[PDB]
Amino acid sequence: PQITLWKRPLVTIKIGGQLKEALLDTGADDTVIEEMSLPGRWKPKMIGGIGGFIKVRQYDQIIIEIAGHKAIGTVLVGPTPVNIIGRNLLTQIGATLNF
Amino acid sequence: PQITLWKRPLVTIKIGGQLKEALLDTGADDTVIEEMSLPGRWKPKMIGGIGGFIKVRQYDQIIIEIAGHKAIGTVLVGPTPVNIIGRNLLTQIGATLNF
Numbered sequence: 435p436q437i438t439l440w441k442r443p444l445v446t447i448k449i450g451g452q453l454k455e456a457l458l459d460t461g462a463d464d465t466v467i468e469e470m471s472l473p474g475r476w477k478p479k480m481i482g483g484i485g486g487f488i489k490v491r492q493y494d495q496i497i498i499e500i501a502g503h504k505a506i507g508t509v510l511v512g513p514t515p516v517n518i519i520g521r522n523l524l525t526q527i528g529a530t531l532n533f
Numbered sequence: 534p535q536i537t538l539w540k541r542p543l544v545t546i547k548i549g550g551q552l553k554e555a556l557l558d559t560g561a562d563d564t565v566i567e568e569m570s571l572p573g574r575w576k577p578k579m580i581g582g583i584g585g586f587i588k589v590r591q592y593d594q595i596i597i598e599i600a601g602h603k604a605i606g607t608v609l610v611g612p613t614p615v616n617i618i619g620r621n622l623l624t625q626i627g628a629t630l631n632f
């Protein structure tokens with residue numbers, strides 16, 4: 435699809451057996467999801483943006499279905515105010531910004 | 534152009550006769566740039582990023598070139614890890630997300 439930017443570019447994702455809404459975010463290096471459990475190993479990380487930093491858990495090799503398209507990569511889990519699909523997964527679904 | 538997302542989507546902007554680097558950010562409703570001098574009056578705005586809420590200065594109707602494309606619109610001035618071009622100006626330059 436061609437997604438407009440007149441509104442937030444929100445899509446449905448499936449992660450850890452759960453459906454969630456998330457923002458397609460070209461400004462995000464990494465994918466960040468609100469608190470949830472995921473299986474496997476994790477390690478702590480700090481990520482920063484407007485307003486400063488939050489502590490997250492870094493889970494590697496997580497599959498996420500994004501608007502119907504599967505992709506695997508690292509997912510950060512923590513107290514983000516919005517679920518964010520970042521570049522690490524946007525590349526894997528072939529997303530581009532066009533103008 | 535068609536911009537892929539394997540690296541950060543950084544572009545040159547021109548504001549106030551000066552060239553700066555900025556990030557094309559579909560996850561940002563608004564455009565936020567680092568401390569600089571802009572003409573005219575400003576109004577207060579609170580914006581909430583990943584780390585919390587901050588105060589910024591809102592300047593309306595500012596001339597700004599984004600990757601060679603002219604725009605005239607609202608610019609927020611305040612502390613940010615990088616200048617971000619949000620949807621208010623991405624729509625003016627005709628950007629969409631595609632996959």
Ligand SMILES: COc1ccc(S(=O)(=O)N(CC(C)C)C[C@@H](O)[C@H](Cc2ccccc2)NC(=O)O[C@@H]2CCOCOC2)cc1
Nearest residue numbers: 461462463464481482483484560561562563580581582583
């Ligand atoms: C390392 O991976 C990262 C992933 C995401 C972020 S971020 O969420 O902080 N962010 C980075 C950007 C500030 C460089 C992505 C943004 O797209 C962020 C995404 C976002 C959106 C809403 C709330 C929290 C985060 N948007 C944002 O800050 O927009 C501001 C703040 C909102 O006000 C209106 O727009 C301006 C930081 C690190």
Ligand SMILES: [Cl-]
Nearest residue numbers: 506507508522
């Ligand atoms: Cl990854």
Ligand SMILES: [Cl-]
Nearest residue numbers: 525528537538
């Ligand atoms: Cl590609």
Ligand SMILES: [Cl-]
Nearest residue numbers: 606607621622
């Ligand atoms: Cl505007």
Ligand code: NA
Nearest residue numbers: 474475494495
């Ligand atoms: Na893992």
Ligand code: NA
Nearest residue numbers: 569570571572
């Ligand atoms: Na000033």
